[PDB]
Amino acid sequence: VDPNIADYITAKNNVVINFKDMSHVNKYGLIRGLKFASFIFQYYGLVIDLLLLGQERATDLAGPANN
């Protein structure tokens, strides 16, 4: 996506997680409970999938890009 969106999303995962009087900056680790976070997770999932299958087998499963 356009880098601005990416910047936003990355900045959203980096929040301060208040719970019952204790907080911390969520420096490392995606937060599932954002609305869009699902998309991010899915996108990250794609990476993992690619790693598993490689470019070729993944390419086959997807098919040709046009069809």
């Binding site: 910047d7 990355t10 900045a11 980096n14 929040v15 301060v16 208040n18 009087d21 900056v25 969520n26 420096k27």
Partner: protein, 211 residues
């Protein structure tokens, strides 16, 4: 009118919040929110964290500090809370600096009066009620005395009624000695002293009677 909270931090409001924080501390955000008629708990806490807390800083960054900042930006992309922490600054301010680098009163007075009233009133209802009962009790006692005294003046001697004893083994301490734990037995003789003190006591009683 009841409504949804928000708005902007008027300086008086900020001051009030600060006072509250001094009073109740940094983890009772509900109470502090309550103290402010306009602003929420979450809002309040956020404000304290972000702007109002004195162990933050808003002094400008040195050239070295600027370098550190922009280097962090280069390396940690827009994870500004993390970046803020690294800097040791609050995050919004840091972001602003980074951006720079790259290129009515009646109501207010009401809440004030209420606020000050609260902060200077630091006791649970049990306490308040208790002191109330104490002063009332005192009043009652004096009224009783006035009656008794009045009657004495009038010529009718009325002994003051005992406290209606709560239990069978309830103690009146003027009846007899509380739990007379006597002094340690006399090595040096004490007889004359006993006499003198007795006389003093009796004399005191006499004086009181005359008084």
């Amino acid at each position: 009118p009841i409504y949804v909270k928000g708005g902007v931090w008027t300086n008086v409001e900020d001051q009030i919040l600060k006072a509250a924080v001094q009073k109740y501390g940094t983890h009772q955000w509900s109470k502090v929110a309550s103290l402010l008629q306009k602003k929420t708990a979450r809002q309040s806490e956020l404000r304290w964290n972000e702007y109002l807390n004195p162990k933050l800083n808003f002094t400008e960054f040195s050239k070295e500090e600027d370098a550190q900042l922009l280097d962090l930006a280069r390396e940690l992309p827009n994870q500004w809370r993390t970046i803020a922490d690294m800097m040791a600054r609050p995050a919004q301010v840091c972001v602003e600096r980074y951006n720079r680098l790259l290129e009515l009163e009646d109501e207010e007075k009401e809440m004030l009066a209420e606020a000050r009233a609260r902060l200077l009133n630091t006791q649970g209802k049990k306490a308040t009620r208790k002191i109330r009962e104490r002063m009332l009790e005192e009043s009652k006692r004096i009224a009783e005395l006035q009656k008794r005294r009045e009657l004495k003046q009038a010529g009718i001697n009325v002994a003051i009624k005992k406290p209606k004893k709560k239990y069978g083994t309830d103690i009146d301490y003027n009846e007899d000695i509380v739990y007379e734990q006597a002094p340690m037995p006399g090595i040096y003789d004490t007889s004359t002293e006993d006499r003198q003190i007795k006389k003093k006591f009796e004399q005191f009683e006499r004086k009181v009677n005359r008084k």
